[PDB]
Amino acid sequence: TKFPKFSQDLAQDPTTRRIWYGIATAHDFETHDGMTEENLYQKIFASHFGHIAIIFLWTSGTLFHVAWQGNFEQWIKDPLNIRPIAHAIWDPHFGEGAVNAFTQAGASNPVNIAYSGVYHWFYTIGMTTNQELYSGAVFLLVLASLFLFAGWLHLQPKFRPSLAWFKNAESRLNHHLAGLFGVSSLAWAGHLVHVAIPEARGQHVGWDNFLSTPPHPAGLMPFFTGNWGVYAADPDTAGHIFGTSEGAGTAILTFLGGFHPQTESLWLTDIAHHHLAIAVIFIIAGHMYRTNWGIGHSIKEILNAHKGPLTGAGHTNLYDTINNSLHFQLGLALASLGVITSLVAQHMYSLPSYAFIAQDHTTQAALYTHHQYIAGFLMVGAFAHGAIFFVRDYDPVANKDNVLARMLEHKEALISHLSWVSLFLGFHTLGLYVHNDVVVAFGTPEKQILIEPVFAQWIQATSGKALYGFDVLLSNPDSIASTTGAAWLPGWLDAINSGTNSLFLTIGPGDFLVHHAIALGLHTTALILIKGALDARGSKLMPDKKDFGYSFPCDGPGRGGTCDISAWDAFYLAMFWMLNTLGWLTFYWHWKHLGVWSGNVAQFNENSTYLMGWFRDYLWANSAQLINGYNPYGVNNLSVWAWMFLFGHLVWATGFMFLISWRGYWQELIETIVWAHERTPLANLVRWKDKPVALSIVQARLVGLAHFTVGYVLTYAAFLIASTAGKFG
């Protein structure tokens, strides 16, 4: 059999495992038959080109469908009432009830409602007509074409890069820091100054007349003379109406701080000075590493110099380890991307940038949940690929005595202390929750154990929150830090000291309990991942686990039984804990923000201290509108969300077949089915080509986890969207 050409062991398999494992190991280039380092790197480079092209095509499609079947040019005229439209609906299986229900947003056909918040983003960056959206879509199509051709070309034999070109860390860091980060952010600041701000002040600027009109009445003279303060003079007033000239300033780079009075978002001039300053900082940073002119630092010398007297070898030889290993780099990148994705969610739900996006609550909830789930996935992937590195790329003789090889020296202490902290969190957190539940159940809720989150309230006070009366730092109007005349202080203190926004929401005892529960979840998921990564090389039960690879089923029932012993099994276990922690996080966020938006903060303040309140006031209470999407009496626009809710509740359960039942039973059943097919007249004419077999053990775990995760995501997505849209949208 030809498929799979990249592996001969799988190509000679007569069963159906050949197809499954060919699909599974397709994009794992490091273990293909006869794979060289150079070819591996070049294939990776081309594939990365492909993913970039796919991303650009996806963005172009979003833009195109919004421009074609949306209501952008009517949404701009009333962002506070009109619902954004994602794409039209063409379902031949629809009935008349669904057609009448989904003809929403003042359309003339069945249509969806966008909850990705792209309308706010497009409005904020100055796109006011759908022709501009169409032009952007076509330009993105062209960009994707260019990137696909670039991948094809740099795959050609004479344009094929060398191995040393792929291992030039200094030049790559310099170019990507100064150019990819600094220059791109500088160009973005230029876009905001030259186009976005004038469009916010009711001036139409496009390609046809941007080269003529200067962004400021004094163009480029103060910048070179040194009179920069001119650009910050006469900012937009608090009576500014977005998109018009009513009460608008002429300043382009300001440090106004706080939020726009109307849009409840950050000032665009603040965005401009922010991205410009960031661009300057990145351009300075990009000139750090020497490439070929003598000037600059070399990473190897830096790492070998920073040796420690307590760590034996310090960061010795880490340059070679990181440069030779691709899994190390992928783990570092995934960890960083996950951390900054969680940061993006946290700092965007509280500091909205796009106009009128705070009012649209469903989109805010969706964005927070989406980017937080993505951050969790990336964080799991970082540890998974780090464990893969330990299995494959780690050298115990090149890294002798450095910090990396010293983790394995005190790995037992790491795992033991981490397990202790997880147990300590879990025991007492569950104890407090159950204590509150029982106490409230007996009709005496005044005996609840309610701890005030003192430290976080103190942090809020330090940032300038005067509600709690700590009067420390920015809350103290006499401290040095609050008397520096910083330009952002008045507006920032005005924004933080109003409960109308999510900026530093008021906290209470239930917030304390749920933050400590989230800490439990984080420490436990980290425990699973770290134990799997550190035990990847081997353990007492399997001292030679490295010789078995990364993903193997077990070692049989011998030595007491060794089910789920590979590091892949540690990843498979930690995925569940990631999902559970994300569930706790998003439930907390959603309930608190539902209370905030409705104004009934008292509900969360009271009933979040015991689990029955979570079960009743959040799960039972908010589900009423969702499950009534379709009724024996009729159907409304939430019908699709109810169907998807049940769809998730079904796929989640379906995953339990693979998670609970194991292989031998299904293999025996398949043997009986094979016998039945072979003995059936008129059915022996048709015979299989690959002998049917049951799914392998690792494949079974993966498939069950996939069904589980898809159901888990879909159920909560449907519930969140339906509840928030019915209640508010």
Binding site: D9, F552, D555, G556, W675, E678, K691, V693
Partner: protein, 80 residues
């Protein structure tokens, strides 16, 4: 097919040979142990990787190891 390897820690206890259900192992003369015999795996093309041989081995960790590889009709134990 799976690969069965016997390391130099075998004590010639013959447990692995008897535990093997598909007749892959064998006892051959040797000198490194008191029993003056060691285990060999001449018929690894018939091994299904059931790990009974390893379960029978009494030495510390395992003197006999089984690594699972390419799956054929024999090594998958198919009757159809």
């Amino acid at each position: 097919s799976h690969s069965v390897k016997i390391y130099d820690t075998c004590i010639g206890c013959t447990q692995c040979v008897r535990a093997c259900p598909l007749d892959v192992l064998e006892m051959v003369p040797w000198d490194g142990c008191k029993a003056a015999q060691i285990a060999s795996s001449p018929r690894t093309e018939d091994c299904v990787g059931c790990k009974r041989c390893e379960t029978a081995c009494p030495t510390d960790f395992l003197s006999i190891r089984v690594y699972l590889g390419a799956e054929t009709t024999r090594s998958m134990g198919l009757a159809y």
